[PDB]
Amino acid sequence: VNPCCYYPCQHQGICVRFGLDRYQCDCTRTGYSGPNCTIPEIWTWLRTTLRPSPSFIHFLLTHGRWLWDFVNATFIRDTLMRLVLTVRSNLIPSPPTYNIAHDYISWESFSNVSYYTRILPSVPRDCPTPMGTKGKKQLPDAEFLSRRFLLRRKFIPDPQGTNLMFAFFAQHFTHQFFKTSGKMGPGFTKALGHGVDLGHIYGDNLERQYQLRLFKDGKLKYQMLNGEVYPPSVEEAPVLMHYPRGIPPQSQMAVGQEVFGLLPGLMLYATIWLREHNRVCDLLKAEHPTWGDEQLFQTARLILIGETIKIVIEEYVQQLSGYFLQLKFDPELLFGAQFQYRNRIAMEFNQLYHWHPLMPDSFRVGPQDYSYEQFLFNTSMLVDYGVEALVDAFSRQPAGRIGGGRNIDHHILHVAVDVIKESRVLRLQPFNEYRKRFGMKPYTSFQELTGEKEMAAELEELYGDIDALEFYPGLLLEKCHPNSIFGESMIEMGAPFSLKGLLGNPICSPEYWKASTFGGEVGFNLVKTATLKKLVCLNTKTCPYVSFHVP
Amino acid sequence: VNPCCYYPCQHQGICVRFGLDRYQCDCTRTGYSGPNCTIPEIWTWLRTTLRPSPSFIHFLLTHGRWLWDFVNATFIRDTLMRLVLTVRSNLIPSPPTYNIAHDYISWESFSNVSYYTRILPSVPRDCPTPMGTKGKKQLPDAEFLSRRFLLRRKFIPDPQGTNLMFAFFAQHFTHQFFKTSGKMGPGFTKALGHGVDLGHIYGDNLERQYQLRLFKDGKLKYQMLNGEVYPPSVEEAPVLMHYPRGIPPQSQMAVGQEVFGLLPGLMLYATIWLREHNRVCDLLKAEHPTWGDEQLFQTARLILIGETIKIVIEEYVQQLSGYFLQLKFDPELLFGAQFQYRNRIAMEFNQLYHWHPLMPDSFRVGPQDYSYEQFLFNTSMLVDYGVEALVDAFSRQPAGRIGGGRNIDHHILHVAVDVIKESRVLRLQPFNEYRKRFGMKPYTSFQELTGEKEMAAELEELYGDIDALEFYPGLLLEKCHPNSIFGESMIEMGAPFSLKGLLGNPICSPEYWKASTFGGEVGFNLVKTATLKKLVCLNTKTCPYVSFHVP
Ligand code: HEM
Ligand code: HEM
Numbered sequence A, B: 001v002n003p004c005c006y007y008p009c010q011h012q013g014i015c016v017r018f019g020l021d022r023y024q025c026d027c028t029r030t031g032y033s034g035p036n037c038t039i040p041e042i043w044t045w046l047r048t049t050l051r052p053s054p055s056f057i058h059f060l061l062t063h064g065r066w067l068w069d070f071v072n073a074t075f076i077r078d079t080l081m082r083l084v085l086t087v088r089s090n091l092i093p094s095p096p097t098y099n100i101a102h103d104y105i106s107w108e109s110f111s112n113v114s115y116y117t118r119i120l121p122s123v124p125r126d127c128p129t130p131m132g133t134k135g136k137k138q139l140p141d142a143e144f145l146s147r148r149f150l151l152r153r154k155f156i157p158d159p160q161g162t163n164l165m166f167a168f169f170a171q172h173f174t175h176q177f178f179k180t181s182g183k184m185g186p187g188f189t190k191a192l193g194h195g196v197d198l199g200h201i202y203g204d205n206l207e208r209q210y211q212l213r214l215f216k217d218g219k220l221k222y223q224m225l226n227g228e229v230y231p232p233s234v235e236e237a238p239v240l241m242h243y244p245r246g247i248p249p250q251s252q253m254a255v256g257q258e259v260f261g262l263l264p265g266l267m268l269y270a271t272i273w274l275r276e277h278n279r280v281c282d283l284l285k286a287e288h289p290t291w292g293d294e295q296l297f298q299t300a301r302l303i304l305i306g307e308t309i310k311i312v313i314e315e316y317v318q319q320l321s322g323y324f325l326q327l328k329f330d331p332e333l334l335f336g337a338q339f340q341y342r343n344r345i346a347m348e349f350n351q352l353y354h355w356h357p358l359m360p361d362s363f364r365v366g367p368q369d370y371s372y373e374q375f376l377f378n379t380s381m382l383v384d385y386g387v388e389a390l391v392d393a394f395s396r397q398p399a400g401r402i403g404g405g406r407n408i409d410h411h412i413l414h415v416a417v418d419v420i421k422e423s424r425v426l427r428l429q430p431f432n433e434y435r436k437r438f439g440m441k442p443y444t445s446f447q448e449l450t451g452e453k454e455m456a457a458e459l460e461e462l463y464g465d466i467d468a469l470e471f472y473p474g475l476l477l478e479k480c481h482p483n484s485i486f487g488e489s490m491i492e493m494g495a496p497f498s499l500k501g502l503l504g505n506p507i508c509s510p511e512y513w514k515a516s517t518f519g520g521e522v523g524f525n526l527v528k529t530a531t532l533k534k535l536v537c538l539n540t541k542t543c544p545y546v547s548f549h550v551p
């Protein structure tokens, strides 16, 4: 058997095969010694024997509002903010390591950017069972596995008060770096850029960008309907979009992210950001009459990227976490750190961000309550209701709890079925392994994972071994934190992939984080001040209730 | 006039235009304050008032062999080696800044890797004279300018004893990152990789690589002639090559760098490296029977990249510098430093590495002395003479002095004429500006630049102002260091671009510098031990006199 199937190398050690039956673990810089990287170094031993559980930490970060308010008011905020940023980032390797093609470092993996990278090499195709050594020879039927534990029976809403506005933002946002190539196969993304390049607004390639560009004042092509700014028509900006056959070009909006047409929530956020872009263009021109299109454009995109990273950290992440510590976006907290300003989208991170449970049962827009079949490809809802209205509604409708189990509306349950299958094609390792890898203890039983005895029992009879429980199912079924949108792992594995892909963006480097980069103080501040409310209300006739938190 | 034409922003400050007549300097992190980034900070003031001249430093680094031998034997070697590596690197920005398209930071410049980057933004197209403010409205006629001061009259040989072996190595090596796109125009390179990706051996794109791959044992396709290994035929590996019309595919060698066919010296080094690749493949297989083609291949390429960086630093750079300090390649000296493992080929660095003066008058291969017209496209010399012989000869023939003036053999004088023109298309700034930028004082007169009164006088009447003297001409005409191959600037501007593009390679990061990366101790050591002699003699029947120094 492939010795490496036993996953012999602990603490990030590398399993190198030798002979036709041997193996050697590479524990370089692992902080452990031994044949399997286990004998720790004294310091490593301390460092670990003292790390308070993720649970304890979470507890502290969500209690003592009073004590926290003081902290937030002192320099300690910055200190903890810097701690989080670094300590969270070291879990993510840079330059990247493997890909679906090479379960070893290789120049090709490092340079061919069409591949989604991965943290842990696949379960070798020559192992006994599919998950390696443990588990059954046949994995649970995805479909079944889904209808049994992921299928929403009764809508459990998210306790944190997360609404639809957040769900759509998340969806919209994540679709700038998760863009799997259907023609290429799993493990291949079209989102070269591998981060927040704001490419769902400008298109993922020059041609497409040029198509959407106005080529005057740094502006972005657009159109007026009911005397309001909405993205241009596919007729005006003839760019490839995904709309069902039969819908005319004169009824389709050209945007950048081909898929964004199949859901008002998306086209909504796509309208706000466009409006915002053209707006920043006007400011820049005032300040720089001498500037040309390209420069104004290029500058505007840089200002928006700043805005995005800001709102994502201080509001979006602040909400998802539920922490009392006021998170902060200040690229300078890292100027002391040893941090590589570079990111690469991991296949693991894509799965782990398949938050479909957020979608409600029905979509209510005022007294009117629309069905999935009325929402899903509705080409009118946006122009009909308009930005302000839709925002107010989405800002009021609460989304579902992400973790916990059985809360994915049947209209999209298929997606999760697919995610499971795809994970298998990718040959992702077992949940329990990832647990370890991202700094956690592996679960000892199914009843430990879920906080109960019922599901735990079935999962046990289905999988056979907890060390066989897969990634996504383990992620979604693991018991939720007290009053949280998800549980320990979703955050403890996702946070790193998240903050790295945020601070790792080049505009966060000391080279780019200069005011000149954004056209001067005006551009810079725009970034330093960005807020979900300003984003909306400065591009809308009236300012609605706008928030990520349900009122 | 464009205020920025006056180059108002000192010490790396950024000149931002405002209004239709204003400008603001961005001195963020420059270490200076003021309207033009001039009022220094106390520390900055000290740091600078104490930096010993480049000249003094050079003097020390080339004297007291005795004292140096001791240093080399102590830990001080490592310390200075680390100092050099960092202090030299900070001069080069990362992520990169501008390109021929954007004289401002921009997402496109940062992501569109087809552009050669630049350190200093172009002389604005709206300036009074071509170099900005000073100088004449018409720049000296390249051709003339060349026949007058660059045209070799009598072969001045390089004093450092640099031979042809070094000249060919340099040429071969640099043609892996300097590969300007003729169809695209100046400022566009085909060498995406922007560094030592050893792509002149594997081709600059998947298809081409696959074409040259044997697809068995990690090997590279090849052929036998006179019972010896030489690159395959264009017939065998049907890859695009540049040979004059009329030469048959069965007489052309497929290699990776399309141009390498027009000069034995190149195809020589291309044969050695190929032989080396297949050799490392055999070692790897012994150790890893279980390994497949791709892995063996991918691993072999990583081992060679290591070998290359090693030989380039400890031997090639050791020779060009002439220092007594034994240079050292140990990726770990930077593991403490704040260093970004990323590189991007600058147009300035390409010019500055146009060492054509190295080429001799005639090419002597034993008692036989060949002419340029017998050497230049000779498809037989390599197979005829064979590796060993050619090496011995090239290792004995001394190359020319690079700096100083009038030492470029007329057969290739055209190249330098072109370089000058191209620099103008790129709109490169004045030599004197680059001097400052790379930490030097600007020349006050032409007679200060050249160490004399004759040429200085003409250059003065031609250019009009020293602050108008261009990049390349200034680079080549500037007076040479005591007994050096070139002068102050060539090294003080080139070294940074050089060491950054060397240590910046991903295999030098803590993530990749593990023994597992190279297949184990065997692969690793191969890297840690690489030497120009081993490179040759382990792939040749007999070991000739092989060195970068003429005997
Ligand atoms: C009613 C709204 C939504 C529907 C109908 C929906 C549906 C889908 C579908 C059909 C896919 C394609 C993969 C497949 O099913 O085979 C997908 C992928 C995905 N969805 Fe959604 N989604 C919605 C909301 C969201 C939300 C709220 C998020 C969470 C941020 C999200 C995150 C993802 C991610 C990241 C992928 C991966 C895309 C890729 O591989 O490129 N989706 N979704
Ligand atoms: C007899 C041998 C050599 C000849 C015939 C030669 C000729 C040329 C020619 C024709 C070009 C193309 C640009 C033009 O002329 O318009 C060129 C470019 C260049 N050469 Fe050579 N060369 C030789 C040796 C070397 C050496 C020793 C070096 C020094 C390392 C070198 C460095 C360069 C560089 C870096 C470029 C830039 C290529 C690019 O832009 O992609 N060459 N050389």
Ligand SMILES: *[C@@H]1O[C@H](CO)[C@@H](O[C@@H]2O[C@H](CO)[C@@H](O)[C@H](O)[C@H]2NC(C)=O)[C@H](O)[C@H]1NC(C)=O
Pocket (backbone or CB within 6 Å): A112, A113, A114, A115, A183, A184, A185, B205, B206, B207, B210
């Ligand atoms: C990046 O990697 C992918 C996968 O290796 C490359 O795509 C394949 O390339 C080979 C050779 O051109 C073809 O035989 C395949 O049909 C290609 N497609 C797929 C889906 O494998 C891709 O060419 C690489 N990209 C670059 C720029 O090197």
Ligand SMILES: *[C@@H]1O[C@H](CO)[C@@H](O[C@@H]2O[C@H](CO)[C@@H](O)[C@H](O)[C@H]2NC(C)=O)[C@H](O)[C@H]1NC(C)=O
Pocket (backbone or CB within 6 Å): A205, A206, A207, A210, B112, B113, B114, B115, B183, B184, B185
């Ligand atoms: C990288 O930049 C170059 C130059 O901007 C791009 O090349 C041009 O692209 C536009 C739009 O496709 C064309 O109109 C030009 O004819 C292209 N060629 C040149 C020489 O300008 C190139 O497409 C960019 N590459 C990527 C991957 O974005």
Ligand SMILES: CCCCCCCCO[C@@H]1O[C@H](CO)[C@@H](O)[C@H](O)[C@H]1O
Pocket (backbone or CB within 6 Å): A051, A052, A053, A054, A057, A060, A061, A080, A083, A084, A087, A088, A091, A438, A439, A440, A492
């Ligand atoms: C109250 C103190 C706040 C410190 C927050 C540090 C960032 C969160 O700390 C996290 O703790 C977990 C357990 O060690 C690990 O899994 C994560 O890798 C680590 O970054």
Ligand SMILES: CCCCCCCCO[C@@H]1O[C@H](CO)[C@@H](O)[C@H](O)[C@H]1O
Pocket (backbone or CB within 6 Å): B051, B052, B053, B054, B057, B060, B061, B080, B083, B084, B087, B088, B091, B438, B439, B440, B492
């Ligand atoms: C004998 C001490 C050796 C120290 C070598 C440090 C590396 C070379 O030092 C160089 O000196 C020049 C003048 O300050 C500058 O132009 C370079 O940027 C700097 O790196």
Ligand SMILES: C[C@H](C(=O)O)c1ccc(C(=O)c2ccc(I)s2)cc1
Pocket (backbone or CB within 6 Å): A084, A088, A317, A320, A321, A327, A352, A353, A490, A491, A492, A493, A494, A495, A496, A498, A499
């Ligand atoms: C700061 C906080 C933390 O690291 O604790 C934090 C940071 C980032 C996130 C985050 O965006 C995400 C965590 C998991 C997914 I999928 S996104 C969640 C929490």
Ligand SMILES: C[C@H](C(=O)O)c1ccc(C(=O)c2ccc(I)s2)cc1
Pocket (backbone or CB within 6 Å): B084, B088, B317, B320, B321, B327, B352, B353, B490, B491, B492, B493, B494, B495, B496, B498, B499
């Ligand atoms: C270590 C030494 C130094 O920095 O002084 C040094 C380092 C690198 C080089 C070097 O390779 C080059 C300098 C100029 C060109 I063009 S290549 C020359 C000298």
Ligand SMILES: *[C@@H]1O[C@H](CO)[C@@H](O)[C@H](O)[C@H]1NC(C)=O
Pocket (backbone or CB within 6 Å): A006, A007, A008, A034, A035, A036, A038
């Ligand atoms: C290393 O791991 C393998 C597989 O788990 C095991 O057989 C072996 O005993 C381990 N060795 C040590 C010292 O733990």
Ligand SMILES: *[C@@H]1O[C@H](CO)[C@@H](O)[C@H](O)[C@H]1NC(C)=O
Pocket (backbone or CB within 6 Å): A373, A374, A375, A378, A379, A380, A381, A382, A384, A385
């Ligand atoms: C689209 O939404 C509108 C409201 O904007 C609604 O009246 C209409 O029926 C919807 N269209 C479909 C096909 O459901």
Ligand SMILES: *[C@@H]1O[C@H](CO)[C@@H](O)[C@H](O)[C@H]1NC(C)=O
Pocket (backbone or CB within 6 Å): B006, B007, B008, B034, B035, B036, B038
């Ligand atoms: C700044 O530079 C400009 C142009 O060289 C000059 O006119 C001006 O006097 C300078 N100001 C200062 C304070 O040096």
Ligand SMILES: *[C@@H]1O[C@H](CO)[C@@H](O)[C@H](O)[C@H]1NC(C)=O
Pocket (backbone or CB within 6 Å): B373, B374, B375, B378, B379, B380, B381, B382, B384, B385
């Ligand atoms: C090529 O070199 C050989 C020696 O290898 C020489 O005899 C021959 O004449 C050369 N060919 C040309 C065209 O000069």
